[PDB]
Design a protein around this ligand. Structure first.
Ligand SMILES: NC(=O)c1ccc[n+]([C@@H]2O[C@H](COP(=O)([O-])OP(=O)(O)OC[C@H]3O[C@@H](n4cnc5c(N)ncnc54)[C@H](OP(=O)(O)O)[C@@H]3O)[C@@H](O)[C@H]2O)c1
Ligand SMILES: NC(=O)c1ccc[n+]([C@@H]2O[C@H](COP(=O)([O-])OP(=O)(O)OC[C@H]3O[C@@H](n4cnc5c(N)ncnc54)[C@H](OP(=O)(O)O)[C@@H]3O)[C@@H](O)[C@H]2O)c1
Ligand SMILES: Cc1cc2nc3c(=O)[nH]c(=O)nc-3n(C[C@H](O)[C@H](O)[C@H](O)COP(=O)(O)O)c2cc1C
Ligand SMILES: Cc1cc2nc3c(=O)[nH]c(=O)nc-3n(C[C@H](O)[C@H](O)[C@H](O)COP(=O)(O)O)c2cc1C
Lengths: 156, 156
């Protein structure tokens, strides 16, 4: 059933973002395709963090996280492929709420306070309450992830 | 903060599906942009159901649900816009696990057993365990939803 899920999801296009946090002083983040809005009242957003890889731990142990929306495919690859210690060496960033890194190449971001975490199977649902949101750049090319690739939309 | 979420999400492209169930004999479904894979072991998928509109209730009160993947934008509009009583009159469908409707124009679908429901703010996270998955059609044009519109991918 695992390979059934992967085969169908491979052809199921999903928006991508880079979630980050300041985990006891360590700047960390990751490319995710599970980001969404969950609730409006209260205003909550969520993503799924892999428990087997320990991706849930930083968010569970930090009071805040940032969701970075970017159209730079290089950034998505960095925050998926490169060693954790190397990720924040190559990119321009500033610190935001709780010291969470805001990526310079983001056209928008959300600052969230950790609201809840719910372990369900081999992932944890990380839920943040939206404290602030920013649209920094109005001209961007939104990407979606499908079949290991990052596509632009035909046509806008 | 609600309008902050909406403004950012309006420019955040998301895959779309139509989840259905057989709710005590009533065929129901809805267009969702919150469908994703949650866990591989166990094999779990999820979507978010609006508690204020009562969209969570049918899934909570049924043992199974089906996730329909389709490239027919007319179907997405039916299962978003049209009255509940009218939806299954206009489309070809067959009954699957627990009587859940499988849409004929789906290029793939998943049959899931309700595994858990978790209320978080004004939505419930509906989690199903994948019992079976099918890829019926190999030639399709995957869509993503952004800014009230359904886009194809540039270019594949
Ligand atoms: N819900 C899940 O627990 C889960 C897990 C894996 C893949 N998937 C879905 O299946 C699709 C295709 O599978 P693939 O192996 O060919 O992935 P892929 O598109 O080649 O993605 C590259 C890597 O990122 C990781 N990844 C992608 N989505 C993830 C997620 N939802 N949770 C944890 N890790 C994730 C996977 O790690 P690993 O190879 O180490 O698993 C994967 O190898 C993915 O795009 C994803 O939507 C879902
Ligand atoms: N997470 C949430 O609770 C939630 C709620 C609404 C919108 N949003 C996000 O904000 C975006 C733009 O807002 P919009 O008002 O212009 O929506 P939209 O794209 O015009 O979508 C049309 C309608 O579908 C409903 N809808 C879309 N996504 C939903 C979801 N996640 N949960 C429950 N209902 C949903 C909304 O109902 P209503 O107008 O009655 O709210 C909306 O009016 C959406 O595309 C969606 O991603 C999220
Ligand atoms: C596009 C894509 C989507 C991903 N989505 C998720 C996700 O939603 N949840 C998750 O835990 N990991 C996801 N990953 C994997 C993480 O990005 C990755 O495990 C994280 O960057 C840490 O990398 P590492 O395990 O090699 O140290 C995704 C990877 C890619 C390529
Ligand atoms: C593309 C789009 C995505 C949607 N995503 C969701 C969702 O994830 N969860 C949800 O409860 N409703 C979602 N909706 C709203 C439902 O489709 C809608 O409430 C359902 O079809 C019942 O319609 P009704 O309230 O007019 O009877 C979405 C609507 C659209 C247009």
């Amino acid at each position: 059933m695992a390979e059934v899920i992967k085969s169908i999801m491979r052809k199921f296009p999903l928006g991508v973002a880079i979630v980050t946090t300041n985990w006891k002083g360590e700047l960390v983040g990751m490319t995710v395709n599970t980001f969404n809005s969950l609730s409006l009242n209260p205003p909550l957003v969520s993503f799924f963090a892999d428990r087997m890889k320990g991706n849930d731990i930083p968010y569970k142990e930090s009071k805040y996280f940032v969701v970075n929306f970017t159209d730079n495919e290089e950034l998505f690859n960095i925050f998926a492929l490169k060693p954790v210690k190397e990720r924040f060496r190559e990119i321009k960033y500033k610190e935001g709420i709780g010291g969470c890194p805001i990526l310079y190449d983001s056209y928008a971001y959300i600052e969230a306070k950790l609201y809840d975490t719910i372990d369900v199977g081999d992932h944890s649902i990380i839920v943040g309450e939206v404290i602030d949101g920013y649209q920094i750049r109005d001209n961007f090319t939104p990407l979606v992830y499908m079949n290991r690739k990052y596509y632009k939309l035909s046509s806008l």
